Structure 1
């Protein structure tokens, strides 16, 4: 009652459960419908589950998951200056970090429970989306270091391709993933 974590029931529960999935009303107020806060949540099963992931999903899935978590943390660390001056006044690298965090939030973490396709998702689809996002991030960082303007990078249709990925049917996903990876490779430096 009141949503306080210091209640004895909550403290007794947190001493024996393996995972805690913290829901937020604030996230639901922002139309982030899954509404699960990743800053307050945690899980103690990842280390023991890594061997299964390395065989049933992919060989580098834990590395991709760790990189995505690190990117989210870096986004969370920059939320003060973006509140002070606004996103348009940041440097190129920080603005790219903010944009990549927005892409993650709106395309991977977010999920529609009433959609006929997005309601369910396999591990391989999540792995593919993470791979695509990380590849785009690397390409964009290289382009930024080369001297490309950030706003020009924001206009690439590869973002439109990536955003639609979670609505692709489970049967047709691998072909879409291959085409999108080819497009990511063929963007940026392939056309300057």
Structure 2
């Protein structure tokens, strides 16, 4: 079904879902280890992966069947939310690589908007990508 999505919805449908699944796969492995040696030894890189992995679970996987909007998520909305999450991931890993505190990213203002994105019925959702990039820049500014 990947070609139907690539031709009618988004060229990067398959690559995006493979990337999210690898995220979730990595989280599962990390949580198993943390179950043993605790979370205190976790590097910033591993804390970031759990942070974004959690956003995938809460902002994407979870859907509210009782909400008038999130009861159904059109194909066009599904990919747009995926790209907001995956774009936040790339930016997150990029910021860490430049010594940005994960704590600074964890409380990034756009995050709360990404969390309520499933409730928006307008593309105002893809605008979050640009809102994410500038916000990280404001974090590249403060260093």
Structure 1 and Structure 2 fold alike (TM over 0.5): yes
Q: Matches of 1:72 and 1:159 in 2, distance apart?
A: 18
Q: Residue 161 of structure 1 contacts residue 180 of structure 1 at CA under 8 Å; is this kept in 2? A: no
Higher relative contact order (CA 8 A, sep 6+): 2
Deviation sequence 1:160-181 (CA, Å, 0-9, x none): 1111100101476555666556
Q: Which has the higher helix share?
A: 2
Matched, 1:93 2:45: yes
CA 1:171–1:138 in structure 2 vs 1: closer, same or farther (change >3 Å)? closer
Partner of 2:6: 54
Q: Answer with 1 or 2: which has the greater Rg.
A: 1
Q: Matches of 1:181 and 1:170 in 2, distance apart?
A: 20
CA positional deviation for 1:84: 2.3
Partner SS state of residue 113, structure 1: coil
Q: Residue 121 of structure 1 contacts residue 170 of structure 1 at CA under 8 Å; is this kept in 2? A: no
Q: Residue 140 of structure 1 contacts residue 188 of structure 1 at CA under 8 Å; is this kept in 2? A: no
Q: Residue 162 of structure 1 contacts residue 180 of structure 1 at CA under 8 Å; is this kept in 2? A: no
**Stretch of structure 1 that moved more, 167-176 or 68-77:** 167-176
CA 1:140–1:180 in structure 2 vs 1: closer, same or farther (change >3 Å)? closer
Aligned length: 143
Q: Matches of 1:174 and 1:150 in 2, distance apart?
A: 24
Q: Matches of 1:180 and 1:112 in 2, distance apart?
A: 24
Stretches of structure 2 that go unaligned for 5 or more consecutive residues are none
What do you get for the CA RMSD once the two structures are aligned?
2.4
Q: Matches of 2:74 and 2:82 in 1, distance apart?
A: 13
Q: Matches of 1:176 and 1:103 in 2, distance apart?
A: 14
Deviation sequence 1:66-101 (CA, Å, 0-9, x none): 111111111111122221243343111111111111
> TM-score, normalization: structure 1?
0.65
Q: Matches of 1:169 and 1:178 in 2, distance apart?
A: 18
